[PDB]
Design a protein around this ligand. Sequence first.
Ligand SMILES: Cc1cc2nc3c(=O)[nH]c(=O)nc-3n(C[C@H](O)[C@H](O)[C@H](O)COP(=O)(O)OP(=O)(O)OC[C@H]3O[C@@H](n4cnc5c(N)ncnc54)[C@H](O)[C@@H]3O)c2cc1C
Length: 521
Amino acid sequence: TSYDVVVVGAGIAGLYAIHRFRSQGLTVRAFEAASGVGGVWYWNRYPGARCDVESIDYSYSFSPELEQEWNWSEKYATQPEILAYLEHVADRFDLRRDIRFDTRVTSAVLDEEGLRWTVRTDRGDEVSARFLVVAAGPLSNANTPAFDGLDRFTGDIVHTARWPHDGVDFTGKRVGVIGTGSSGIQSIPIIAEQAEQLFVFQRSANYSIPAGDDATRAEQKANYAERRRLSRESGGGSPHRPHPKSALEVSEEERRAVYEERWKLGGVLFSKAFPDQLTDPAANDTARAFWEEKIRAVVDDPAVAELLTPKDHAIGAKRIVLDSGYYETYNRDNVELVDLRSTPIVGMDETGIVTTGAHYDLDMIVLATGFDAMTGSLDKLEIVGRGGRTLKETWAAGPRTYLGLGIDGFPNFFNLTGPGSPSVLANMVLHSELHVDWVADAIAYLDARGAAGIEGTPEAVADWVEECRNRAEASLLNSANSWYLGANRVFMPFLGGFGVYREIITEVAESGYKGFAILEG
Ligand SMILES: Cc1cc2nc3c(=O)[nH]c(=O)nc-3n(C[C@H](O)[C@H](O)[C@H](O)COP(=O)(O)OP(=O)(O)OC[C@H]3O[C@@H](n4cnc5c(N)ncnc54)[C@H](O)[C@@H]3O)c2cc1C
C-alpha cells in the first residue's frame, strides 16, 4: 500500500512518468479509469480522429531506439495508430504491471505530519504515496447537451466520446450530426461518404484548415536529434518559427505567398505565420480574410460558404481544427447544413429532430461533443491539502500555481501540463517529457539532501499568477468567450513560449528550487 509515487492517468504523460520514475528507483503505482493505456487516444475513437501536430514531433524523444524503430504511416497520425504506438510503448517498457485499470481516483488527502498523500479509489484502493503526480490530461468531455424527447427517438444515438469499438455502418442511413467542433469536423467527411444523407446541425462555425516517400523518411530519422533541439527551444514544441517582419509591414504578394506556405504545413502553425497575428486585431483580420477566400473557393454554394464562415471571432483564438476534405463535403448532393441560429433544435421525437422550422427524418443521430479545457479532470478529484483545504477551494478565484508545478498548501503534489504551464499551447508529448523530467529531478534533489518534501511558496505563486496575467493580457487568445479561460478572467496557460518556459523551470531547478520551500522530515 506504500509507494514513492502515485500517478493519476495512463496516457502519454502517465506512461512516461512510470518509466522515468522507475529508472531512478522509485516505486510507482498508477491508476487509470479506462480499460487500457492511451488516454485521449484510448477514449476518443470517432471516425477520423487525428493529431494536430506532425507525428515526427508529436511522439516521444526519450528513447533513441523507439524513434528509429517506429515508423509513422503518415504526416498526421490517426487515433488508431497513435494508440498502437502508445501500446507498443507500454509493451516495450513493461509499464502495465504498475497500472490498475478501470479504477478512478476519487480523493487524495495530505497527512501533514508525514508529508504523504493517501489516495483513494472507486474500487476501494487505499494507497500512501510520498509524491502525488496527476497526469489526468488537459481535455475532458464537455457535457452531452440535454435534448427534449431524446429518449423517444427510435433510431441510433452515437456519441463521438464513446464510439463503438467495432464501428458504425452509415450505409443506407439518414444521419444527423450535432456539433461542429473538431470531433464533428473530423467525422463529418467520413460519415458523408457512406451515409445516404447527412444533415449537419450547426450552432457556431469554427476555423479549420487542410491536413495535406521512403528516401525522405530516412532523412528526418538521421536528423532527429537536431529537430528535437529546435523543438525544445521553440515557441510551440515544433521546429518552426514565425516570419521576421510584421503582418501589416509586407507586400500583398509576399503576404499571399507566406499565408499559402503556412496554409500547407499545419493549422496551429498557420496561426503563427506572422509575429503579430495573435496580438493585433487588424493583423488577424488579414489571416481571417485569407481563410474566408480559400473556403469560398472550395465551397460551391456562396450561401453555404458564408454559413461555414465564423461570425466574428479572431482566427487562432480557438485552436484551428485540422480537416481532411471537410469543406469539400458540403458540395455533395447528400449533405445539408442546417443553421441552428435560424432554426434551433427544440427536441427529438420517434423519427428524428424537430427544429423551429422543419422536422428531420433520421435513422441516426451523432452527438459530436466538445472538450472542456484544463481543469475538468482535476475538478472531479477531491485533493485535500494543508488545513484540510481542497484544491478546488484554493482555485475558486482562478488557478494559482508557481510554474504550474507548485501550489502552497500542496507539498509533494504535482499537476502535469496544466494551469501555469504552456499546457495545450505546446506539443504535449515534449511538454510531458519536460514536466515528468523536472519532477524526477526535484525528487532526486530531495533524496540527495535527506529532505521530506517540496512546496510552492505563497510569494512565488502570486508572482507567477501575475506573470501569466501579463503575458496573456496582450494576446487575442484572451478573448471574452475564450477556450483558455478560468474562474476569476484568468487565462490559464503560460503564454510566453515553450522554450522560454523550459528555460525558466530549469534555471529554477539549477538554483536549488527558489520559490519552493524545501521541507524536512
Ligand atoms: C483529436 C485530438 C487531437 C489532438 N492532437 C494533439 C496534437 O497534435 N498535439 C498536442 O500537443 N495535443 C493534442 N491533443 C491534446 C491531447 O489531449 C494531449 O496531447 C494528450 O491527451 C496529453 O496526454 P496526457 O497523458 O497528458 O492526457 P490524456 O491523454 O488525457 O490522459 C489522461 C488519462 O488520465 C485518466 N484519468 C483522468 N482522471 C482520472 C482519475 N480520477 N482516475 C483515474 N484516471 C484518470 C484519463 O482516463 C486518461 O486516460 C489532441 C486531442 C484530441 C482529442
